[PDB]
Each structure stands twice: as C-alpha cells, then as structure tokens.
Structure 1
Amino acid sequence: MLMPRRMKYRKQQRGRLKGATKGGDYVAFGDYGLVALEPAWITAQQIEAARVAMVRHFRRGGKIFIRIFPDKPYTKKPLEVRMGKGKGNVEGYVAVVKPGRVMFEVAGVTEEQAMEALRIAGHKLPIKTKIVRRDAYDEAQ
C-alpha cells in the first residue's frame, strides 16, 4: 500500500490539526504543485488513487513527486462492539495535511497535461486544492 516498514509503536494518539503547514509550503521539486486548502487526514488509499490517476492520465510521460507520507496509524474497533476493553486495531495509515501544504509535484510535462493531471488527483482527495507554478518558491537561499 504505502505504510512505513517499521515503527517503534503500532498505535498512536489521534491528536489535532491547528492550521498552517509548518513545512512543505513551497514547490522545490517539479514545475507544478497541488496545495491543500483544508486540514485533514489523507488515507494512503487516497494518496495512492490520486497518484495512479496522474500516471494514468499522462501515461508514459513526466515524473511525479508525492510530497506527503502516511506514517500515522488509523485505529477502528470491530463492528457491533461496545465501548472500552482497549484501543482498536489499526486499519491503515494516514498522512496529516494542513493548509498550505504542497502535496504533489509534476515535471517534464506540458502545462496542459500538468493542470489536467492535478485537477484529477484533487478529485480523489478529501479536501479542496489549488494548483501552482514556481517563482518565490525558491528558498534556495
């Protein structure tokens, strides 16, 4: 799928989502990027679906950069079970995304293909997106 090979701990506390991405806000790799506008937990099955959606779109073409990674475990109790008796079992992993985060990047692809590409990938994401270019996104120094 797209989980981590090993982890010191298998289940971990839920947490929260205070706006601002902290990091990952500029392009820095490809030419066009997809930036998250709402905060959320993106399941690896979505990251995946979106990715495949792009390669599928411009089959045999440019390069894709997945800027996020699902390292946070998702717990879910069984069905018809009551509360308590311990924490649920891990059902998958998710990457936490905050507003401003550049989730994906593309390169070696026409500006038409780039747009269309990311527009399809955002239709697989639980949130709202924005497509970007490159310019001040040059924190080289």
Structure 2
Amino acid sequence: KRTKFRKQFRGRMTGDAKGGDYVAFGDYGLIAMEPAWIKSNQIEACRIVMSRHFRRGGKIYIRIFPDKPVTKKPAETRMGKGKGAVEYWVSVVKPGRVMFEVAGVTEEQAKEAFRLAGHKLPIQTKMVKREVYDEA
C-alpha cells in the first residue's frame, strides 16, 4: 500500500511489458487492455470489494505495488520551486501483466469477482486460464 523509504521525485514513461505472465500463484488472473495510471487509492479500494464476496477462503497476491511517486497541484500559484511529493502513488501497467488473481473459489465466484472490481478502472480488463507456461 505505502512505501517505507524512497527518494524525492521520479519519472514517467510508457514502455512495453517485461512480464508476459498470465497465471501466478493461483488459477485465474486479470490483464488490462490499454495503458492507465493505477492509483494506490484503488488497490485497497477494490481489496475490500473482493473480501465481502469471498467467505472463508479468499487470498490475493497483489504485486502491482505503486512505485511512481508524483507531485500534487498547490492551491494558488504554481510558480517557484518544486511541488509536494505527499499525495498518492501510482504504477504504470502495460497491457499484458496481471493485477488481480485468486485461487480456491468456483467459476461463478470468479467471473463475477473480477467483474465487480473493474468499474473504477480507467481501462478495460479481461480474465485468463490455463495453457500458460514460460519457465521452471
């Protein structure tokens, strides 16, 4: 959710995906379609959503931890030194990676699980399945 110790500011750029993994620690997954800025205020927001639907047996391996600290608009005149790096944190998500994934639940408790938590997503996403092998 939040970092422990980092620098001042960072950068921003849209690059290709380096992790063409579909299945990770589970069965189903969640892959985006178009680049978007995932704010840290969304991971925890959808977290409780996938918790109220899962009754005894709901584990999620979130690996989309935000690591792109940005600035925030003042409230008067943006002329002078830098800005305040105290607001929120995002992370570039290139279409081809996984942001959500579970294991144990049934099909009906999966097709709807990832369906509910997706309206707040700037872009559209989809689900995956087996037939995914890369390395040992």
State the TM-score, normalized to the length of structure 2. Answer: 0.89
Match of 1:12 in 2: 10
Report the identity percentage: 61
- Structure 1 residues 57-66 or 30-39, which shifts more? 57-66
Match of 2:102 in 1: 106
How far is the alpha carbon of 1:26 from its aligned partner?
2.0
CA distance in 1, matches of 2:63, 2:103: 13
Q: 1:41 aligns with which of 37, 44, 55?
A: 37
Deviations 1:56-91 (A, max 9, x none): 222332211213111211211311223x31221121
How far is the alpha carbon of 1:24 from its aligned partner?
5.0
CA distance in 2, matches of 1:95, 1:49: 16
- 3-state SS of 1:94 partner: strand
How far is the alpha carbon of 1:111 from its aligned partner?
1.1
The structure with the greater share of residues assigned to helix is: 1
Read off the aligned partner of 2:126 and give its amino acid letter.
K
Match of 1:125 in 2: 121
Pairing 1:38-117 to 2, within 5 Å after superposition: 38-82=34-78, 84-90=79-85, 91-117=87-113
RMSD: 1.6
- The answer to whether the 8 Å contact 1:77/1:87 transfers is no
- Cα 1:106/1:48, change in 2 over 3 Å: same
- The answer to whether the 8 Å contact 2:60/2:102 transfers is yes
Unaligned stretches of 5+ in structure 1?
A: none
- The answer to whether the 8 Å contact 2:67/2:89 transfers is yes
Read off the aligned partner of 1:86 and give its amino acid letter.
K
The structure with the greater share of residues assigned to strand is: 1
How far is the alpha carbon of 1:92 from its aligned partner?
1.1
CA distance in 2, matches of 1:59, 1:87: 47
Match of 2:2 in 1: 3
- 3-state SS of 2:127 partner: strand
